[PDB]
């Protein structure tokens, strides 16, 4: 755990399940917890949070723990962001994991989409299309979520320092963020986004730490951090993996980190990384990997007002 401005205990290590498939998700969640994984991330988008809740509900009875040790978290999708929708996506999302209060919900991205049916939204451009709400409005829709006790902090996904400081700046904010989720390895390092996050108070979560492989638009070229033969280098030296190098990484750094799988093997050995250091050389040769080279960059909506990526940090 990493404390939050709240005086919270987030877990410094959680189990991803984007792309975590009806069928092995809960199967994967109950190995999760029985290894000792408190913190799971979830989203909406995900469709598969109802699968993630009967894994919960059943560790929860069968008494292999207790709700206020789990640290659940999920997220608001943008072509949600209108009052009204805001609470209807929570519900759905609350309902599905089978819980009575999330311990952390996020804004997923920044730009607020067209809201309908499509998930993402385009023109006969490719590009995508924009909607009337913006992240502020549902920020107080969200804020509202915390004062009945249905959530117990908000936070962020991908926002540059600049959407940060436009929350912070918001007139009226009854909640301040807890944590930024973002994309963070050897390949996008992130020290200013990180510097910047930490000197208010803010956390930053590491997504995609593993190079998310299984990634639908993986090209072959692409960097391959599970095989950088630098990085196994490093892990052979402490009779470990490279995955638990990549994850450690993270910790070593006060950065929360949510490595995603579904195979039992694996769910464990991503967490035994409380049981071996690097050296600082070890993090300074490390840090020297990065390539301003992101995994996730998909919607490329640069036209559109608050895009994260485009900015330093
Ligand atoms: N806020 C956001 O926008 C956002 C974006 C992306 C991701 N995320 C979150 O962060 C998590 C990040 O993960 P990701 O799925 O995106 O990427 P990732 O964790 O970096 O990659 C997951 C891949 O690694 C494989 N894998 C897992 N553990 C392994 C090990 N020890 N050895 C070898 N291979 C291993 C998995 O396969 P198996 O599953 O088959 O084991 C899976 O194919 C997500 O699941 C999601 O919860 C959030
Ligand atoms: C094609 C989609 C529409 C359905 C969801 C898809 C992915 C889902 C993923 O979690 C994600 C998270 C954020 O980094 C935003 C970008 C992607 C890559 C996202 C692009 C849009």
């Given at each position: 755990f990493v404390e939050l401005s709240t005086k919270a205990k987030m877990p410094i290590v959680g189990l991803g399940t984007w792309k975590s498939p009806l069928g092995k998700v809960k199967e994967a969640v109950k190995v999760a917890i029985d290894a000792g994984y408190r913190h799971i991330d979830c989203a909406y988008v995900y469709q598969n949070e109802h699968e993630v809740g009967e894994a919960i509900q059943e560790k929860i009875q069968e008494k292999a723990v207790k709700r206020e040790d789990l640290f659940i978290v999920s997220k608001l999708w943008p072509t949600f962001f209108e009052r009204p929708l805001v609470r209807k996506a929570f519900e759905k999302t609350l309902k599905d994991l089978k819980l009575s209060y999330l311990d952390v919900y996020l804004i997923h991205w920044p730009q607020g989409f067209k809201s309908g049916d499509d998930l993402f939204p385009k023109d006969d451009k490719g590009n995508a299309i924009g909607g009337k709400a913006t992240?502020?409005?549902?920020?107080?829709?969200?804020?509202?979520?915390?004062?009945?006790?249905?959530?117990?902090?908000?936070?962020?996904?991908?926002?540059?320092?600049?959407?940060?400081?436009?929350?912070?700046?918001?007139?009226?904010?009854?909640?301040?963020?807890?944590?930024?989720?973002?994309?963070?390895?050897?390949?996008?390092?992130?020290?200013?986004?990180?510097?910047?996050?930490?000197?208010?108070?803010?956390?930053?979560?590491?997504?995609?730490?593993?190079?998310?492989?299984?990634?639908?638009?993986?090209?072959?070229?692409?960097?391959?951090?599970?095989?950088?033969?630098?990085?196994?280098?490093?892990?052979?030296?402490?009779?470990?993996?490279?995955?638990?190098?990549?994850?450690?990484?993270?910790?070593?750094?006060?950065?929360?980190?949510?490595?995603?799988?579904?195979?039992?093997?694996?769910?464990?050995?991503?967490?035994?990384?409380?049981?071996?250091?690097?050296?600082?050389?070890?993090?300074?040769?490390?840090?020297?990997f990065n390539r301003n080279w992101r995994a996730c960059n998909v919607l490329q909506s640069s036209h559109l007002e608050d895009y994260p990526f485009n900015a330093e940090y």
């Open positions: 992240f502020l409005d549902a920020w107080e829709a969200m804020e509202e979520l915390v004062d009945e006790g249905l959530v117990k902090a908000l936070g962020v996904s991908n926002f540059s320092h600049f959407q940060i400081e436009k929350l912070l700046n918001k007139p009226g904010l009854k909640y301040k963020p807890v944590t930024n989720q973002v994309e963070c390895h050897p390949y996008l390092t992130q020290e200013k986004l990180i510097q910047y996050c930490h000197s208010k108070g803010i956390t930053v979560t590491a997504y995609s730490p593993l190079g998310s492989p299984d990634r639908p638009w993986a090209k072959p070229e692409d960097p391959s951090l599970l095989e950088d033969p630098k990085i196994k280098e490093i892990a052979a030296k402490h009779k470990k993996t490279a995955a638990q190098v990549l994850i450690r990484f993270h910790i070593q750094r006060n950065v929360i980190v949510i490595p995603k799988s579904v195979t039992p093997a694996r769910i464990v050995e991503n967490i035994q990384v409380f049981d071996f250091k690097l050296s600082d050389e070890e993090m300074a040769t490390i840090l020297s």
